[PDB]
Every structure is written in C-alpha cells, then in structure tokens.
Amino acid sequence: GQVRQRYLYTSGPHGLSSCHLEIREDGTVGCAADQSPESLLQLKALKPGVIQILGVKTSRFLCQRPDGALYGSLHFDPEACSFRELLLEDGYNVYQSEAHGLPLHLPGNKSPHRDPAPRGPARFLPLPG
C-alpha cells in the first residue's frame, strides 16, 4: 500500500494570504491561510492511477458529491472518493474524480470573485507532510 503525507496548496484570488485546502470536523471544506494540520492529507494508492485522500487530523475521507461539491466523510466511497492523478508539463498536479469524471475544486457554486473565462479545475501543489 503506497501512501504519502503532504499538504494540499492551491493559489487563488488575492486575499488575506495563501489558500491551503482545509477539512473541518463538521465535514465542511474550504481553504486555509494559517496552514494547520487540518490541511494535511495522506494520499493512499488504491489502484494504479487511482488514489484516496484521508485527512489525518479529522480522520475523515474527502469525497466529492455528484454536484461536484467537496466534503469529508466518515465512510470510504470509491465511486466518489476515488481520484485520478494528473500531471501537467508545467510540473503541477491536479485531481479528478475517476468515477464520474467530476473535477476537484474548492466549494463555491458561482458566487466568489473569479477572473473572466473559467479555465476549469484548480491547480494543486502537494507540499511534504
């Protein structure tokens, strides 16, 4: 079982500071600027090309719902928590639900400030954890 511990970091619109993926005990998901353990996710390799992300602090599995929303769960669901590893020539890494092909991104259904023209999924940088 190949597993690694790393912090998920994705750049976004100017704000208080950097934005790091953060999982709450309530099962909510959002970014963090204080960089804490909640933003520490241990990725486990289920099958070649497919991995799972478990929050060590919350011990909750991060799964994406059909609507494409992110949320922590007390149970493992391959059909939603299974993600595919994407590598860009630029050297960035992104995740996409293999089950339905839904893109992985922070919650925000049309509302927060977003530059013109939506590129699509947000880029994530995994820091050693």
From Swiss-Prot:
Keyword Signal annotated: yes
GO terms under biological process: cell-cell signaling; fibroblast growth factor receptor signaling pathway; neurogenesis; positive regulation of cell population proliferation; positive regulation of cold-induced thermogenesis; positive regulation of D-glucose import; positive regulation of ERK1 and ERK2 cascade; positive regulation of MAPK cascade
Entry GO terms, CC: cytoplasm; extracellular region; extracellular space
Protein localization: Secreted
Top-level taxonomic group: Eukaryota
Keywords of the record: Growth factor, Secreted, Signal
Single annotated GO MF: fibroblast growth factor receptor binding
Function summary: Stimulates glucose uptake in differentiated adipocytes via the induction of glucose transporter SLC2A1/GLUT1 expression (but not SLC2A4/GLUT4 expression). Activity requires the presence of KLB. Regulates systemic glucose homeostasis and insulin sensitivity.
Quaternary structure (record): Interacts (via C-terminus) with KLB; this interaction is direct. Interacts with FGFR4.
Similarity annotation: Belongs to the heparin-binding growth factors family.
Protein's name according to its UniProt entry: Fibroblast growth factor 21
Origin species: Homo sapiens (Human)
